[PDB]
Amino acid sequence: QSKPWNRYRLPTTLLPDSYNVTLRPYLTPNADGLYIFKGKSIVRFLCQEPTDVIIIHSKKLNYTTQGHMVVLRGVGDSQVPEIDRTELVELTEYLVVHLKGSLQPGHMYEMESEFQGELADDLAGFYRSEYMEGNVKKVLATTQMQSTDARKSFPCFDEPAMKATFNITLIHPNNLTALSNMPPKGSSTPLAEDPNWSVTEFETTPVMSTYLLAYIVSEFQSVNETAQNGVLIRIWARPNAIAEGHGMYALNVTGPILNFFANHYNTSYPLPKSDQIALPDFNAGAMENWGLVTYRENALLFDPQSSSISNKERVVTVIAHELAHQWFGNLVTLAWWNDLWLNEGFASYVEYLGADHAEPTWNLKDLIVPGDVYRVMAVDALASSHPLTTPAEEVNTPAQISEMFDSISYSKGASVIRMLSNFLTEDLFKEGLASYLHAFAYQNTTYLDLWEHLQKAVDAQTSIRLPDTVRAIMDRWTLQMGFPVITVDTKTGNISQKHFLLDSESNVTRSSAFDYLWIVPISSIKNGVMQDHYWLRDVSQAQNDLFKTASDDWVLLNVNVTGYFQVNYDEDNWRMIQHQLQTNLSVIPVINRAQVIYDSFNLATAHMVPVTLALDNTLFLNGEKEYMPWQAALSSLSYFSLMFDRSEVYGPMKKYLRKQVEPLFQHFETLTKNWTERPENLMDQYSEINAISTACSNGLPQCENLAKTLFDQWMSDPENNPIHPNLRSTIYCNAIAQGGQDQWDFAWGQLQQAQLVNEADKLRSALACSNEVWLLNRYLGYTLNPDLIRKQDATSTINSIASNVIGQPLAWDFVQSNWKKLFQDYGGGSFSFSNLIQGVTRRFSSEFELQQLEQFKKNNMDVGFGSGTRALEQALEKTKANIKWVKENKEVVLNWFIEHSS
Numbered sequence: 001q002s003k004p005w006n007r008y009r010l011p012t013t014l015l016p017d018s019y020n021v022t023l024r025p026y027l028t029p030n031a032d033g034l035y036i037f038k039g040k041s042i043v044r045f046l047c048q049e050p051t052d053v054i055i056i057h058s059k060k061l062n063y064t065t066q067g068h069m070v071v072l073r074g075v076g077d078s079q080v081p082e083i084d085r086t087e088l089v090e091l092t093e094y095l096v097v098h099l100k101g102s103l104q105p106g107h108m109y110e111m112e113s114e115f116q117g118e119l120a121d122d123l124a125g126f127y128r129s130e131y132m133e134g135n136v137k138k139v140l141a142t143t144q145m146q147s148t149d150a151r152k153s154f155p156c157f158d159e160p161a162m163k164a165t166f167n168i169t170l171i172h173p174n175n176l177t178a179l180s181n182m183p184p185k186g187s188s189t190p191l192a193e194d195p196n197w198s199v200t201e202f203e204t205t206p207v208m209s210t211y212l213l214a215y216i217v218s219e220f221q222s223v224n225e226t227a228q229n230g231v232l233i234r235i236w237a238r239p240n241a242i243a244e245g246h247g248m249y250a251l252n253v254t255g256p257i258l259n260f261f262a263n264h265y266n267t268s269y270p271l272p273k274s275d276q277i278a279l280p281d282f283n284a285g286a287m288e289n290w291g292l293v294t295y296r297e298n299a300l301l302f303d304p305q306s307s308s309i310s311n312k313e314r315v316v317t318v319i320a321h322e323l324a325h326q327w328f329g330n331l332v333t334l335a336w337w338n339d340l341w342l343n344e345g346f347a348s349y350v351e352y353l354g355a356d357h358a359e360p361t362w363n364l365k366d367l368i369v370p371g372d373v374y375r376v377m378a379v380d381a382l383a384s385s386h387p388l389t390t391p392a393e394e395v396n397t398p399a400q401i402s403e404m405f406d407s408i409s410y411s412k413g414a415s416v417i418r419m420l421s422n423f424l425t426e427d428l429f430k431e432g433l434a435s436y437l438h439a440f441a442y443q444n445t446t447y448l449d450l451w452e453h454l455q456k457a458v459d460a461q462t463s464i465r466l467p468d469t470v471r472a473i474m475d476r477w478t479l480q481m482g483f484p485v486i487t488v489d490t491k492t493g494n495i496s497q498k499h500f501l502l503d504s505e506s507n508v509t510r511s512s513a514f515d516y517l518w519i520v521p522i523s524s525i526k527n528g529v530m531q532d533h534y535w536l537r538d539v540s541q542a543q544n545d546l547f548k549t550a551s552d553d554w555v556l557l558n559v560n561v562t563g564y565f566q567v568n569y570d571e572d573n574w575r576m577i578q579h580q581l582q583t584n585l586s587v588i589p590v591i592n593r594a595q596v597i598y599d600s601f602n603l604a605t606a607h608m609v610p611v612t613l614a615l616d617n618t619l620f621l622n623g624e625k626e627y628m629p630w631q632a633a634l635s636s637l638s639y640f641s642l643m644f645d646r647s648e649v650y651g652p653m654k655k656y657l658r659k660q661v662e663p664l665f666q667h668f669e670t671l672t673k674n675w676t677e678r679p680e681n682l683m684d685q686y687s688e689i690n691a692i693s694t695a696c697s698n699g700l701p702q703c704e705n706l707a708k709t710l711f712d713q714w715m716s717d718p719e720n721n722p723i724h725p726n727l728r729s730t731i732y733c734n735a736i737a738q739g740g741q742d743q744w745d746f747a748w749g750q751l752q753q754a755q756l757v758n759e760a761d762k763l764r765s766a767l768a769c770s771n772e773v774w775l776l777n778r779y780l781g782y783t784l785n786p787d788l789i790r791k792q793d794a795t796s797t798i799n800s801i802a803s804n805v806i807g808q809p810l811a812w813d814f815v816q817s818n819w820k821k822l823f824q825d826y827g828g829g830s831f832s833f834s835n836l837i838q839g840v841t842r843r844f845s846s847e848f849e850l851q852q853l854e855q856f857k858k859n860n861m862d863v864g865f866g867s868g869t870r871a872l873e874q875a876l877e878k879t880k881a882n883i884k885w886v887k888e889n890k891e892v893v894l895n896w897f898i899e900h901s902s
């Protein structure tokens, strides 16, 4: 029998009731340069089963408690056993209190400790964050408990189902502000031992999970709003950011998003206030701490002067995502990390709904298709994928827990939940959702609890009928990896399903309890008219007249790609769809105009259609005004550009794209009144951004003229940038491409004085668009200079240069030559060799290039590859795949482009 302190899961013998936690960050180092925090805690817990050991989590804490590492008392008149000894077991991250007798069922105990830890700049637990305000380096104290780091700040039963109330006190410099989950109890009071410090106590939290705790000590300031129901809403940021008004957009959307969710969830916002805080360089991006949500600055702040529309979209959706969790995830919590997909998947879906409420003219809900569905299908159409569900007993270590946070959990989770809501109808979905939240409020669940409540809503009505239970359907989508391609023969109306893999030669070795068969909801449109809904049962082949067509008719499946699958047709139906798109595109919903392109290119990759059929699906684009179908083409063709931009294929390709985009460019020229005013809504603005990008990068003279004119105008009046933030990346890039050192030196000067990260990013990237070899090489020479290029931006800048067809050999030589910088950057800055390697070798598609990559690997003697070890293996395998693809596709693609480039 293994000792419990050697098991990764806590015993169930003791359950926490409530905690007092007092934390005191020391924001001045101890002269050795060490920053620390001190703390004191008392946990009150209940004995469920007799035990003579207390096992609680503790990570990187030193104990200074008088006596043993803890003091143990009984609550009320309970007697307590004497402590035998306390020890720390580092591997399983435990503090272990061995007792001389047993705790008694039904009795409550209080365990007190005093401790300290490093306030490291490690983004884990209670940690420090350094940033600049003018000449002064500022340091604040903040938290990131997700997933298993609460125990790094104080000893606790650090599993999500072991919920408790928390009384947080911060002891901090008297001129700084202290924030936590709950409002402060009142005004701060001086610390008696040293009145330079103050003591801020916070109101008791609701019953909640340790991973959602937060506390922050900083100089930050806020913009505020009180909602009609009295809920205080604040956006916190650096005093300069607040003064510039960069917190305003977030403040604008927050109230409406909270209102949307209270109604959507049929549940009041469960806290007295909402704080959201913008942290400089918060690498986790965003964390849904209950009542105190943390964001990286560029995720929460918005500058109308320099920020593009895509920046606005990022802000409203990231906010909606975190706010979604304040009910789903925080109020009702998944019992264990193996079900992380339900929590993050749900938030990743409803972020679009919440954002749509704040910005109802934007059609934001559409963006889940490009943003999540087709994104995750790329990795879920591999033999190396994995099911959404993982047995709980396989998820034990903090590393195993962290592995839950991936593209499948977030984006496939979002995709399958959106499919579920769609086939149930939103009204029915919302009813089950409300029932689930009301039943499990302040408690924990598994995904089976949601299915059961959804089933209850299904069973309480008669309109929506399903081919099986909610659970049996969802099991097909959650217990096995991947997704089917649905193939229709419109001559007969025969319809089939099979596990879709991009590599037709791939061997799947992960077994499925269902033999990779799904129960598939199938909406369809025929001649532009919605048909009756259909369910494909767990069969390989079926037939229905819904999918049988006449010679002059067409059918199209999966309206708005609500279903998590791709669709193939017989060539005749494809041709009819193409005809419809050529003659009157308005008849096919915009999302399906994108689907036709997305799916066919994937099908070509899989050898289920010829590559020419996929290309034929781009032919209609010359008349397409809307964002998504163009985006689908551009995403699908980026690999073609990557493979062929140094070959004889490139000329006809550019010419074809010039032909396709010219009318869209012309359209926006008129609509925008000679480019003076942006289109109204988000999607049209996105379309303009892509149109100008496509036009300019493919050498459309009218676009080249625009870019030169705007940049020249800017150079003649630097303080007044005439280029709208939406277009800056293209205009900057094309203009630097056309020009020489005058444009380059001007943009470099602008970069060096850039106050805002998003503008600096645009400049760094555009500078890589120079067509002068000497300018690119001189630029490369700058990438390793911290005075000129931030370390964190080094590999990104090299990759941008590599992306330039001219910079490709320059960057590859630069990387090979300077690879002797691994023992300079691995302990001091992680650097990410993996990204660099992938970026620089991205183009490789010849045996000769493979031979070069093998030769570079032949420095195996010491130096190594660091964190990019076996990312080099991925590059070698990718090159082999590229060689095979180019050989198979070169002639066919060349001839298609020549044929269709006029």
Ligand SMILES: *[C@@H]1O[C@H](CO)[C@@H](O[C@@H]2O[C@H](CO)[C@@H](O[C@@H]3O[C@H](CO)[C@@H](O)[C@H](O)[C@H]3NC(C)=O)[C@H](O)[C@H]2NC(C)=O)[C@H](O)[C@H]1NC(C)=O
Residues within 6 Å of the ligand: 020, 042, 044, 110, 167
């Ligand atoms: C977790 O923290 C809580 C907040 O500090 C503690 O509750 C507080 O306990 C204090 C006593 O330890 C009380 O303060 C005063 O104590 C003096 C003792 O001499 C009494 O005269 C007073 O009655 C009392 N002051 C007032 C204004 O009543 C606090 O009253 C009390 N605060 C509360 C209940 O909100 C918890 O004790 C602590 N938990 C554990 C297990 O230690």
Ligand SMILES: *[C@@H]1O[C@H](CO)[C@@H](O[C@@H]2O[C@H](CO)[C@@H](O[C@@H]3O[C@H](CO)[C@@H](O)[C@H](O)[C@H]3NC(C)=O)[C@H](O)[C@H]2NC(C)=O)[C@H](O)[C@H]1NC(C)=O
Residues within 6 Å of the ligand: 036, 037, 062, 116, 117, 118
């Ligand atoms: C938690 O306790 C740890 C173990 O006691 C502390 O880590 C130790 O810090 C010591 C002092 O800072 C280091 O020992 C030596 O200290 C002398 C005098 O300060 C120096 O001359 C030496 O350079 C130093 N030794 C070395 C090899 O550098 C220990 O290195 C170190 N022990 C470890 C890490 O196992 C923590 O500081 C303490 N943390 C907090 C937040 O209180």
Ligand SMILES: *[C@@H]1O[C@H](CO)[C@@H](O[C@@H]2O[C@H](CO)[C@@H](O[C@@H]3O[C@H](CO)[C@@H](O)[C@H](O)[C@H]3NC(C)=O)[C@H](O)[C@H]2NC(C)=O)[C@H](O)[C@H]1NC(C)=O
Residues within 6 Å of the ligand: 248, 249, 252, 302, 304
């Ligand atoms: C947070 O919400 C605010 C209220 O809805 C928005 O405030 C609006 O800002 C607009 C842009 O600054 C203003 O529109 C126009 O501004 C120009 C330039 O100064 C003026 O010429 C126009 O008179 C003005 N109105 C027009 C063209 O109709 C709005 O006036 C203003 N609305 C209100 C009620 O004050 C904020 O924009 C918003 N913050 C962010 C970052 O989006």
Ligand SMILES: *[C@@H]1O[C@H](CO)[C@@H](O[C@@H]2O[C@H](CO)[C@@H](O)[C@H](O)[C@H]2NC(C)=O)[C@H](O)[C@H]1NC(C)=O
Residues within 6 Å of the ligand: 018, 019, 020, 042, 043, 044, 166, 167, 204
């Ligand atoms: C955290 O603070 C709360 C609020 O003061 C404490 O809740 C009280 O707990 C005591 C002892 O169990 C009860 O007599 C009171 O009825 C509670 N008050 C309320 C409003 O719930 C809680 O005990 C504190 N936590 C700890 C660990 O001391």
Ligand SMILES: *[C@@H]1O[C@H](CO)[C@@H](O[C@@H]2O[C@H](CO)[C@@H](O)[C@H](O)[C@H]2NC(C)=O)[C@H](O)[C@H]1NC(C)=O
Residues within 6 Å of the ligand: 028, 136, 173, 175, 176, 219
């Ligand atoms: C809070 O008080 C501290 C200590 O007086 C201030 O920190 C100093 O700030 C000045 C800049 O004006 C620096 O020159 C010093 O080096 C800082 N001293 C220390 C010990 O850090 C701080 O500026 C005050 N902050 C606010 C918001 O009032």
Ligand SMILES: *[C@@H]1O[C@H](CO)[C@@H](O[C@@H]2O[C@H](CO)[C@@H](O)[C@H](O)[C@H]2NC(C)=O)[C@H](O)[C@H]1NC(C)=O
Residues within 6 Å of the ligand: 262, 263, 265, 266, 267, 268
């Ligand atoms: C949650 O939903 C319920 C049920 O729809 C809401 O109660 C209804 O409110 C409307 C509004 O006038 C009434 O017409 C219905 O008669 C109510 N139905 C019932 C059964 O009470 C309720 O207001 C919602 N609650 C929250 C907190 O959002």
Ligand SMILES: *[C@@H]1O[C@H](CO)[C@@H](O[C@@H]2O[C@H](CO)[C@@H](O)[C@H](O)[C@H]2NC(C)=O)[C@H](O)[C@H]1NC(C)=O
Residues within 6 Å of the ligand: 015, 161, 162, 163, 335, 440, 443, 444, 445
């Ligand atoms: C995890 O969640 C379950 C609910 O899904 C909790 O069990 C419930 O506890 C409440 C409140 O004490 C009872 O009213 C219910 O009867 C329980 N339902 C059950 C057992 O199905 C459970 O307590 C939570 N786990 C922890 C450690 O708090």
Ligand SMILES: *[C@@H]1O[C@H](CO)[C@@H](O[C@@H]2O[C@H](CO)[C@@H](O)[C@H](O)[C@H]2NC(C)=O)[C@H](O)[C@H]1NC(C)=O
Residues within 6 Å of the ligand: 489, 492, 494, 543
């Ligand atoms: C469409 O499905 C039908 C029926 O499932 C297929 O017809 C069957 O084909 C096999 C081939 O040997 C015959 O043995 C059966 O007798 C046929 N069943 C009939 C006619 O009812 C048909 O081949 C399919 N058509 C396709 C895939 O184009």
Ligand SMILES: *[C@@H]1O[C@H](CO)[C@@H](O[C@@H]2O[C@H](CO)[C@@H](O)[C@H](O)[C@H]2NC(C)=O)[C@H](O)[C@H]1NC(C)=O
Residues within 6 Å of the ligand: 363, 366, 559, 560, 589, 590, 591
């Ligand atoms: C397919 O998606 C489109 C959006 O791309 C849906 O059209 C929207 O529908 C709602 C409700 O009918 C309207 O409020 C919006 O104004 C519509 N927007 C546009 C641009 O048309 C359409 O309803 C979806 N089709 C199906 C069958 O669900």
Ligand SMILES: *[C@@H]1O[C@H](CO)[C@@H](O)[C@H](O)[C@H]1NC(C)=O
Residues within 6 Å of the ligand: 505, 506, 507
């Ligand atoms: C897959 O299995 C087949 C034999 O069934 C074999 O020919 C092939 O080499 C295997 N691997 C790949 C990557 O195709």
Ligand SMILES: *[C@@H]1O[C@H](CO)[C@@H](O)[C@H](O)[C@H]1NC(C)=O
Residues within 6 Å of the ligand: 584, 586, 587
């Ligand atoms: C094309 O179809 C749209 C949408 O169904 C319709 O409104 C329009 O009349 C049609 N236009 C033409 C030119 O056929």
Ligand SMILES: [Zn+2]
Residues within 6 Å of the ligand: 288, 321, 322, 325, 343, 344, 347, 348
């Ligand atoms: Zn989330």
